[PDB]
Design a protein around this motif. Sequence first.
Motif, PDB file in Angstrom:
ATOM      1  N   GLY A 153       0.830  -1.236   0.000  1.00  0.00           N
ATOM      2  CA  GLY A 153       0.000   0.000   0.000  1.00  0.00           C
ATOM      3  C   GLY A 153       0.843   1.255   0.000  1.00  0.00           C
ATOM      4  O   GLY A 153       2.062   1.170   0.094  1.00  0.00           O
ATOM      5  N   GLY A 154       0.192   2.416  -0.088  1.00  0.00           N
ATOM      6  CA  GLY A 154       0.902   3.675  -0.191  1.00  0.00           C
ATOM      7  C   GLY A 154       1.697   3.752  -1.479  1.00  0.00           C
ATOM      8  O   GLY A 154       1.146   4.051  -2.543  1.00  0.00           O
ATOM      9  N   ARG A 155       3.000   3.503  -1.395  1.00  0.00           N
ATOM     10  CA  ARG A 155       3.817   3.348  -2.596  1.00  0.00           C
ATOM     11  C   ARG A 155       3.261   2.195  -3.434  1.00  0.00           C
ATOM     12  O   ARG A 155       3.026   1.098  -2.899  1.00  0.00           O
ATOM     13  N   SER A 191     -14.379   1.022  -1.783  1.00  0.00           N
ATOM     14  CA  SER A 191     -14.062   2.397  -1.438  1.00  0.00           C
ATOM     15  C   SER A 191     -14.974   3.376  -2.157  1.00  0.00           C
ATOM     16  O   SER A 191     -15.242   3.239  -3.355  1.00  0.00           O
ATOM     17  N   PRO A 200     -21.417  -3.299   4.574  1.00  0.00           N
ATOM     18  CA  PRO A 200     -20.428  -2.833   5.560  1.00  0.00           C
ATOM     19  C   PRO A 200     -18.979  -2.940   5.097  1.00  0.00           C
ATOM     20  O   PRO A 200     -18.103  -2.370   5.762  1.00  0.00           O
ATOM     21  N   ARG A 201     -18.709  -3.620   3.978  1.00  0.00           N
ATOM     22  CA  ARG A 201     -17.348  -3.686   3.452  1.00  0.00           C
ATOM     23  C   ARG A 201     -16.831  -2.331   2.972  1.00  0.00           C
ATOM     24  O   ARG A 201     -15.613  -2.157   2.853  1.00  0.00           O
ATOM     25  N   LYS A 236     -15.469   1.353   2.535  1.00  0.00           N
ATOM     26  CA  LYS A 236     -14.778   2.433   3.226  1.00  0.00           C
ATOM     27  C   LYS A 236     -15.258   3.769   2.660  1.00  0.00           C
ATOM     28  O   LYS A 236     -15.068   4.061   1.470  1.00  0.00           O
ATOM     29  N   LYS A 289     -10.536  16.358   8.955  1.00  0.00           N
ATOM     30  CA  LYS A 289      -9.893  15.503   9.948  1.00  0.00           C
ATOM     31  C   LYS A 289     -10.916  14.900  10.906  1.00  0.00           C
ATOM     32  O   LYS A 289     -10.824  13.719  11.248  1.00  0.00           O
ATOM     33  N   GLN A 290     -11.920  15.682  11.311  1.00  0.00           N
ATOM     34  CA  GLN A 290     -12.960  15.172  12.196  1.00  0.00           C
ATOM     35  C   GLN A 290     -13.783  14.092  11.499  1.00  0.00           C
ATOM     36  O   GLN A 290     -14.069  13.040  12.079  1.00  0.00           O
ATOM     37  N   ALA A 337     -12.985  12.150   9.128  1.00  0.00           N
ATOM     38  CA  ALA A 337     -12.189  10.969   8.826  1.00  0.00           C
ATOM     39  C   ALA A 337     -11.786  10.196  10.071  1.00  0.00           C
ATOM     40  O   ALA A 337     -11.211   9.122   9.937  1.00  0.00           O
ATOM     41  N   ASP A 338     -12.094  10.697  11.264  1.00  0.00           N
ATOM     42  CA  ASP A 338     -11.725  10.025  12.508  1.00  0.00           C
ATOM     43  C   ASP A 338     -12.878   9.114  12.919  1.00  0.00           C
ATOM     44  O   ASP A 338     -13.882   9.558  13.494  1.00  0.00           O
ATOM     45  N   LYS A 339     -12.728   7.819  12.635  1.00  0.00           N
ATOM     46  CA  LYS A 339     -13.841   6.902  12.849  1.00  0.00           C
ATOM     47  C   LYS A 339     -14.163   6.758  14.328  1.00  0.00           C
ATOM     48  O   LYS A 339     -15.301   6.443  14.699  1.00  0.00           O
ATOM     49  N   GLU A 340     -13.181   6.995  15.198  1.00  0.00           N
ATOM     50  CA  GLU A 340     -13.436   6.949  16.629  1.00  0.00           C
ATOM     51  C   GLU A 340     -14.339   8.100  17.056  1.00  0.00           C
ATOM     52  O   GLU A 340     -15.308   7.902  17.795  1.00  0.00           O
TER      53      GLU A 340
END
Lengths: 336, 143
Positions: free
Chosen positions: B1-3, B62, B94-95, B97, B115-116, B118-121
Motif C-alpha cells: 500500500g501507499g507506494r 471504497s 459494511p465492506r 470504506k 480531519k474530524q 475521517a476520525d472513525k473513533e
Amino acid sequence: GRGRLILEHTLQGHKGRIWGVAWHPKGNVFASCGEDKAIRIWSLTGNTWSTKTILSDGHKRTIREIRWSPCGQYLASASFDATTAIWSKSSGEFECNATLEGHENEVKSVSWSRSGGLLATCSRDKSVWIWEVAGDDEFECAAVLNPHTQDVKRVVWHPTKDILASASYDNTIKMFAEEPIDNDWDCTATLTSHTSTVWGIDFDADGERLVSCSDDTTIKIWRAYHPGNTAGVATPDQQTVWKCVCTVSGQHSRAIYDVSWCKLTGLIATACGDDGIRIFKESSDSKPDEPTFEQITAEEGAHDQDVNSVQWNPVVAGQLISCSDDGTIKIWKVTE
Amino acid sequence: GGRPTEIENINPNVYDRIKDPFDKREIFDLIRNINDPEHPLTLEELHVVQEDLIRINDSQNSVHISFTPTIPHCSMATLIGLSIRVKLLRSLPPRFKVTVEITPGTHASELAVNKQLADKERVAAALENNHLAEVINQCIAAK
Ligand code: NA
C-alpha cells in the motif's frame, strides 16, 4: 520477505466492531472489548479458544480499550461513557470493584505502570490523568495533565520506569515523569514529527526507543537521548529528549490505528485501516542513530474491514492477536 | 500500500481474479435528497453534493464524496458531512470504506472539518449522542 504470517484461529463473539484485544500476562488468556459494551475473557482449552466469561453492565457506552494489571489479577476498561472501570476476581467471578470518573468526555485509553501501582487515563477532553492504586477500592488522583491541545488517543507506561507516554489527535506524543524534588507530575518532552493523528505508541524492551503510528500512514522510531549523551543531542531543559531517528513511509494506504513492539522478538506489527497486518524487523547492520526497519511479511487482507489492534503475546514468541471492525478476532503465528 | 506495487510485479491474488456494481450515479441517488439542516432544500438543490464530485470503486470497497458547503464559513459543514456518512453507512454494505471531504478550497476550515469526519473513533462517539443522531436522521429522511 521470506517471512510468513499464518492464521491460526478466527473468533467472533461480539456484535459489531471490536475495538481492542489484550493478552493476559501469562499468554493463555485474553480479553476483548467493543461497541456492544461487553468485555469477553477468552481462554485456551486444548487447541480451541472460547469465551469463558462476559462482563456486561460495567459501562453504558462503547468500551474502547482494556488492559491487564502486570500481576494479571485486575482488568481496566476505558469507555466512551467517560469512566474507567477496574475489575478483579475475588469471588471466583470477575466483578467491578471501582469506577474512576472525572473526565469531561469519552475515555479513550487506560494503562498500568510496571509495578501496577499507577494507572493512567486519557480522554477526548484533551487531558491525561494519573491515579495512584492503593487498594481494590482505593484510588487517589495524582495528576491532571493538560499539555495536549486535542483529543488524546493513547497512553502507555514505560516498561522499566514510571514514565508515561501519550499520543494525540494534535499530532504529537508527550512524555510525563515525576519532578524529583516535590514529586509533581509534569510534561518532560514533546515528540513532533507526525503530520496527523498519532493513534499508537509502544516502547521497545529497555524503553530507550518508542514506535509510533499515525493517520499520516507512517510509523516512526524515536530514540531517547539523556543529558550527557555521547551523540551530542542537545538537552537544554536538562530533560531526556526524544528524536525521530527513522520514518517508515509508503507501506500503508490508510490510517494506522495500532502498533505493537514485541519484547521477546523485537518485531513490530501494525494494524491498518486498509485491512492489512504488517510485520517489521530491524536490519542487522542498522546504526543506532539512523536505524533501518524492513517489512519481513504481511497479510494485506488480514481482515475484511479496518484492523483496530495488534498485540504480541507476552509469553509465546511470535504469536500475534488482532481485532477488526469486521467483528472478528484473529490469532496468528509469524515465522521469520 | 501507499507506494504502488512495483511495476515489474503483479499481485498473485490479482492475477487469479482477472483469470451490477455500484457506480457514481447510484451513490449520487443515495445522497442527493439529503436535506440541509437549516433550509427546506436538498443538498443537491444547494449545490452541496454533485455527481461529478463522487468517486467509487466497488471491487476495492471504497467510495469518496466531495461536498461543497454553501459558504466558506459554513458552521454546519461537519453536520452535513456526517449526515452523508450515516446515509452511506446504512445503505452500502459494511465492506465499504467511506471518505467524506470538503471540496478543496471551498471552506475556510476544510482541513479541520475533514480531519474530524475521517476520525472513525470520534464519528462513532458522535453517533452515540441521541440528540445528534436524531437531528441527522431528520436530515437524511427523504420526503
Ligand atoms: Na493496598
